[PDB]
Amino acid sequence: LVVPNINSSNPTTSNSAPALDAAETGHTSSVQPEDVIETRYVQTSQTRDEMSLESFLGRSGCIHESKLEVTLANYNKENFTVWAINLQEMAQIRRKFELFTYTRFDSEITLVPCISALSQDIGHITMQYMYVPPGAPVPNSRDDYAWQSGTNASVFWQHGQAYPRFSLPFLSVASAYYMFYDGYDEQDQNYGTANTNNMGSLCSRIVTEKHIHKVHIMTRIYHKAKHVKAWCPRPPRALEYTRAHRTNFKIEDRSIQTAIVTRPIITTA
């Protein structure tokens, strides 16, 4: 994708003022360097590929850090985690996608599981990550029958194994994901994207049977968009995020602080 060349320009004395316009119209000016100055002929050679959406959004970033603290006391009763999937909990990723009103893409998920040794050894640890779409039974314990995964997709990782990874196709029941939603429940509740963005949960359990080593397992989840499309650009988020699915920005006993830096006097740059 090529940037146009800067053409040669000469001294003009004319009735048409390309520099003069009306921005009241809501249209951006069309003035190029050649219209305002006696320009030199330069052969520009820049591709714009890296500025494409595929390039911009097609990078893996963290969207969730799942901590499983293995308890040896009630081994089968606990030792599992549940997380309602979404891209609203980590700022770097969230801000990039919210530059658009609607987005559509496939997802690549890469998992980075880290075992923290709290005993002399870690033994042999194996984890199971299961995707539970809305409506499927959510596991209630480490030994829940739902872990049989008769039809849900599960992925297994054992100590020593490379980072797991798999793709998910565009999941919505609509034609695009809603990055913003000016609407409600059928009950006039839950303003926002909580209504529209119900992708189910990601559940995990330590598969290895009762053992004697305390460990904590932190699995960070990375998401990368593939084959991306987006519509209706929006201004970038100017303040810290406080909640998922809400554009709220007020923090208790703290003033609104944007990234604009003030200066003493506007006649000094």
Binding site: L1, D49, S167, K226
Partner: peptide, 25 residues
Amino acid sequence: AQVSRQNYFNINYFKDAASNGASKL
């Protein structure tokens, strides 16, 4: 098939398109 680059080899190995790598611009 083979593609040029900003020449390299590339074919899809899986049956679902979601599996494919980044899109060509």
